[model samples]
Target chain A: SRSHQELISQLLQSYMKLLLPDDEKFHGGWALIDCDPSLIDATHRDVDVLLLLSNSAYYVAYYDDEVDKVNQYQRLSLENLEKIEIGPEPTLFGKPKFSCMRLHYRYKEASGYFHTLRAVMRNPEEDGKDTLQCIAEMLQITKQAMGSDLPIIEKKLEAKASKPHEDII
Target chain B: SRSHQELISQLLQSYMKLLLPDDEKFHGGWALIDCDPSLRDVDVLLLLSNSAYYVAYYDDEVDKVNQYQRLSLENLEKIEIGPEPTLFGKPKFSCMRLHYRYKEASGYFHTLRAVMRNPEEDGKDTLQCIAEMLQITKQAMGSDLPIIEKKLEAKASKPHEDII
Candidate 1:
């Protein structure tokens, strides 16, 4: 009996450990990692933790309590990543990437803009997946609410920012 | 507005008079003529003054207070005499005329055992035409509730007396 109680306590302890720095776990049918900025701000600091769990397929955005940058992370099940499921295995009908739209609220800088990130799937099953497309659509809706439209911004971010010469004091 | 009020009052007064006897100076849609005790203890009644609206309705029986039957009669429009009106003037339709067959109820001499419906719809053209309708109607309820009434009340007074 004592061992059963200890086992439950250890299980809960292990579960709580997976709450990556600034992230909280939300579960329904499957465990999902969602970033709650309200929770981040409540800590009186920024959360900067980009963690990828090797078991649960999810994405989390974290920030340090003191920092302004919003650090992001992705999670994927090792079984899914390694294609080791018993049956046909969960398939990704799209690219092995989490297409994400960044919501950056810079309290310190007082000037912040929307940044899009395509957190690539380490090794997705297929080239183009419908599940990714569904998630991409949801991200688009989320960005539009902030009065912004997200497009393919990976190539744009890859380009170098050009600065013209000005008078040096 | 004045005319509407006056018309309403006249209608109310006419309805009140219709319930009472002919000697009471108020017109009745139907009157109690004769009730028969011989064949079946049934009441026979007449509707001497039939209104265009309620020419066909009259309460043949009244009951004591605090009773369901009494309250039922209070709300019901009994078309005791005259012709039953049909809405669409359809072919071969009939209306309730009189209930001849009688069953005995305590306190009341007879309760209607069977109710007969007027099977013919020889519609009236005017006030005068209603007279012709009465020949058939008088023969009808006169043949119906009244004959039963005279016989019923008499038999009720002498329940054990044999028919002579």
Candidate 2:
């Protein structure tokens, strides 16, 4: 085991390497986000789910550390990615600001399933605001890197609850 | 070129490895951070400018090693604590908003959000160490940058509602 300070130092240097990748030899950014599973999947009661992004697609995954060591993981690439939408700003006036984002994707040419991944920023660990923000910003950057127009949509607090797999196809 | 999980797993693993290096070497502690950047909102770590050499971090995610960002400590002007996670997903409740001063150039404010590796208690602990270390490191260095900063003081509290 090691002290927290040592760990912090190492972590800081890691990103420095990325931002200064030319100087550090790296490239790209990613976000390992935790969000409200209630809207996307209601199989379980209330907890957070993981939303991940790759170079070419968006992945949403769920698992219970207790029962399911491995769970269902969803992926929809930027090419298949259609409309990208988000909810409103998080205000202290609201408890579960429920700031969220919904993704509309055609995963396959003949199919259509719009996924809404919401980060109910009610709890301390949940990062709804940031999750939504990064999801869009990165999506924009990745598209630009691919030289595509940015997917855009938002404005209106869609703070409602839903089932667990709701954020799926 | 593999299953999404495979790609994600490896990416995450890369981050896990960084936090705890196999060698476990000590990189001269830059500064104890409490509030981190927009994308990070995990453990509690503070960034006390005006005397440190580098910015340090302690979070659960392993995306970008963007935490140790070198700060322009000289520009550090005000420190405020806020509540709510915004554009960058930080539990800014434990936020320490630090505004800067070019006093006039092109500058945006950076926040110091909650350091979750137990900052309340460790916070008191960090306060002592970085404070003293900052003082000692003070009685000993000369760091400089030639670029000019700006006047982020223009009502940026809830600033980035749009692109400036």
Candidate 3:
């Protein structure tokens, strides 16, 4: 009776409501959340999970659009943040880079890994790193809040920064 | 100045860019790119090349983004398609199979199974497109070379070691 995308969308919202804090809800914004570019069919390659990030928590729900139901769901509250591995090495040209970095995120305390290149993350373009980094900074906010607040104003990005600007990484 | 994702994306596209064709430079599309539901390793793309027909696919079996592996039309034995079964909303799909004998590092190979991944118009058309392209490729091959050209309606007795 209903379409697949909407079906998955509704399932995601349901999980988010139960998992994330009641203070905030996902306003908008969607991304192709993939783990090692898992086996999503018909050659387009991507997991069926839909990810919507808010200031409160991460809302991820996997639905087989074909199957028409939420097969699984995970709510990683901002409180249980873990380090997201942004690659430290320069990607080699022509040669194979066997490192499929892990996104070792946690639910409360338990953790699971989302394999990077080796498994594959369908970033599409340059934005892949930025996407993961954005998640990291959010996670850090939770960490730093644990360390207590500070009254310093700093330019983290853009404009005249304290550190010499490195060409857009 | 570098990223694994960018490099991987480049490798997938670069191989496609190089393999498809020289004529229309319209190496823009690919299809039926699905994996064997069982193995769930590597996704194959059925592309229509202007120069020659090819069964090109991307690999992840290495636990690495293996560069695009292209199987020339001549190497294919047949595009074995199974009957599309219907059940209680069991994810609509059309199963397509491709098996061929080719020298991968001078070894042998076969693509176990594939199906129209999602139920969409474009995806549906992809299989249809392959059907048409195969016909064109069949006539173009001069009745000599074949791209899964031989027929495949043989009943599988389910013998254990099926080589083709």
Candidate 4:
């Protein structure tokens, strides 16, 4: 992947805040998104569902609890557990945010051939405190998906980025 | 790439009614859209500006224009534009109709994928009319993006498939 590193780096940076809970606490495993069928053992990047947004739409993927693929795949066969849709409820779990895939162009580092990867969580909203907690979590997931082999840690900063974050066009 | 053909076909069908004068007579261009810098153009499908509703958004790609490189690379820019911040007093556009996307998804498809969202407010029934127009025109455009896109392809589809 050409800019895949940079693209993923920028993406992981975008989500740094969501993974870490606060000063002393850290939330782990699946956040138990207030979805219909719990995302218990979904594959790392399986397109779980599609979010048809106001403008464009994106496929949603999430990493939750670690379970054996053989059992999970078997469970899917037995239970027919697939396809979850998000209703118009503002908050999922404790975090108030909406998840959608963002389209972007990238080039392969090896070949420089251009391709598109729909990055997740372009916009995150907080209902009460005016925070972007979910955005932070999404950044965490992006890192886990991309830089899983590398050493990474969530950093804290004084106050959220003051400038209102706009989706990078 | 699996549904590449299907996507093209659906795009054309969604656009036919809007292009025909008798369909909606809504002739809008891209200039009114570019006028406002604050107007965020996301993915050529839709744009957002403050409107009567919290913010009214329009989807141009829903009519069959997808892929930025596909269009400008060919010097053929599809005319998809709208106002920036809405004007005061009785605004020109109505929110009463079922938004275009919803009409196409839930109403058009025989097997509903998900529950339909009700976004329209005052003139609710007007949306039903708009949806009917949208459904009929969508099929008229048909399945091939290239074929439907050509300046020549035109014909009212036979009443084979039910227009949701």
Candidate 5:
């Protein structure tokens, strides 16, 4: 029933070009880990689609209407992303599929969490698992950037802050 | 009591600056019409992006949460958001309203409405509460979004037509 698989693929490719703009920067410095329609309505955010940029510092892009102009729509340095985990969920038949990923941690002092699901289309060529693969690559890059030390202190602070009450208890 | 408001507000403000780096463009082109915590959850948010002064309302259904609801500043057909018994300032709790219409693939017209409520001040200062919602929205809608186009173009169309 979905007759436009090729069309969507082509559009997605073009969209990425504008989204990233710099080829060397994209490939050498960052990796495109995920892309999908957000669970939230698009009109409200002016984003037709969303993207996760995996780099030394993480970033999330909320893409909008145009394909070429490369609207600097907005950029958040997710340097504080604690971790990212990808998992599978069964939709109809009980057969499970790995198509969902959760990005957890804090951003700019706000405790943030994002749960995203990949798009499944008639296109068999699309594995629907690139999100996981790219994220794997991202983890490798993150580990290298983080070096050997465990980023434990930041994580603990986040945990304590989110708990009911601090000193009141 | 509302110590968290300042924290959330500060985060939201910084987030917005990164999102919409162009201040003049933001204030001039976009209007901050309504701000509220989404009914689904306080942490999650719902925004009505109206460039033309528009709005809508709908009943919530589980699994399906008003996805069909659309808003356009153009077809702002109806607007009713108040128990403004006294026309001075917003009420103790203010309700923001909107209605919008957009054409679907069938070519037939579809209309939607949304009613969002601004939370009560509780112990927080009313100004602080409003600031929190406004900044939250500004952060969400501002920069860091992708730019995507999904329409299928005619093969005969000129390549320059699509060039940036």
Candidate 6:
């Protein structure tokens, strides 16, 4: 049991370097998230994904334990996140189909960059709702930090400047 | 004019290494595609950067350009993204949208919107192709590939047997 725990700790450390590189400042921790198996490469069968939240950004790291390689490292900031939906409970298709959670976020780098981030846990022991709350709390704290310093004058000026025609009306 | 061509050529080479790292076997040429700037991070930190983004890929299976594709940061799109609260206070599927542009026959551009998801569920077998492609493109584009929109209207799942 301790061996497994140590292995995970070492894995999380690898994730830390990926999510919060030395060049940048970041905050937050890692969580074990279930990922959709079908979405991953066939080479990797396990659907256990590591979710990293830091600097108000979310990073999903999918590792292929067999290959000893990271199959996917997706990074999306919280500001661009639009929606996260839980799909219907998975059905049986020879193999057990686990429930899937889909994350939808807008990419502002272009015109129509909308993509869904889906994953399922390796096991169903952890509560998805509880995990969502943890993420929500992190977001709330980040937002509060920004809000505390956001001045009323700037908001008024920004609103007026951004919507001059509406302001004039 | 020669300098401009050389600059773009060098940019494509940088993109090549990114898409096909030494660890993996890959081969392909580069194509210049027009891109929209909105999806790019145009911050002031890297104005010294001037490079044209190129689309490069590995075509072991076939010689089609569509087999693998990734746009440059300027070509891709995204504003800093992060999580927000949901209506039920539970994390419901809150889908985000991204817009992409591609060149048609007339050199005209068409825009398509896409949703991001895990590669397995999103029909992203080309995920590695895309991810690596973007890495190379970002390096060549001299910026982070805007964390945004990408679209590939592949008819791989279509009923080809009936047509024949």
Of the two candidates 1 and 2, the one with more favorable DockQ, higher being better, is 2
Q: What is the interface RMSD of candidate 3, in Å?
A: 19.9
C-alpha root-mean-square deviation, each candidate = 35.5, 16.1, 20.7, 22.5, 23.1, 25.0
Each model's TM-score for chain A is: 0.26, 0.54, 0.46, 0.17, 0.43, 0.49
lDDT of 5 by residue, B1-164 (tens): 55543443334334334322232212111112223323132111122231221111122332111212223334333322333222345434333222223342222221111122223322122222222223333334442211111221112211111100
Off by over 4 Å in 3: A1-169, B1-28, B39-42, B56-64, B84-91, B103-125, B144-164
Error of 1 at B154 (Å): 87
Best-to-worst ranking by lDDT: 2, 3, 6, 5, 1, 4
- Comparing 4 with 6 on TM-score, the higher-scoring candidate is 6
Better of 1 and 3 by DockQ: 3
lDDT of 2 by residue, A1-169 (tens): 8445445565555544432213221112222223333433445353324454444555555544454222555545667666677775333355644555666666435444554555422234443454456446656655555445666776654534323332232
Write candidate 4's Cα lDDT for A1-169 as tens digits: 5586899887786664443323312223221121221244543343222211111111222333344221111001101111111112222345323332111212121222111112233254422111123332333344334332111111111111112112211
User: What is the lDDT for B68 in model 1?
Assistant: 16
The value of fnat for model 5 is: 0.00
- Give lDDT for model 1: 0.30
Once fitted onto the true fold, the runs of candidate 5 whose alpha carbons sit more than 4 angstroms away are A1-55, A65-74, A89-98, A108-112, A115-127, A146-169, B1-164
| Candidate 5 per-residue C-alpha lDDT over A37-151 given as tens digits, one digit per residue, 9 for 90 to 100 | 3343323223322333433333333332454122222233345456554555324346443454455545345564443434322133434454344443443344445443212
- Looking at model 6, give its docking quality level: incorrect
Q: Model-by-model lDDT, in order?
A: 0.30, 0.41, 0.37, 0.24, 0.30, 0.32
| TM-scores of the candidates in the order shown | 0.19, 0.39, 0.29, 0.19, 0.28, 0.31
Taking the candidates in order, what DockQ does each have? 0.00, 0.07, 0.01, 0.01, 0.01, 0.01
Residue A84 miss distance in model 2 (angstroms): 1.3
The Cα RMSD in angstroms, rounded to one decimal, for candidate 1 relative to the true structure is: 35.5
Compute the lDDT of residue B140 as modeled in candidate 6.
Answer: 46
* CA lDDT, candidate 2, residue B43: 37
Fraction of true contacts kept, per model? Answer: 0.00, 0.06, 0.00, 0.00, 0.00, 0.00
Name the runs in model 2 displaced over 4 angstroms.
Answer: A1-44, A54-56, A65-70, A88-97, A120-131, A155-169, B1-164
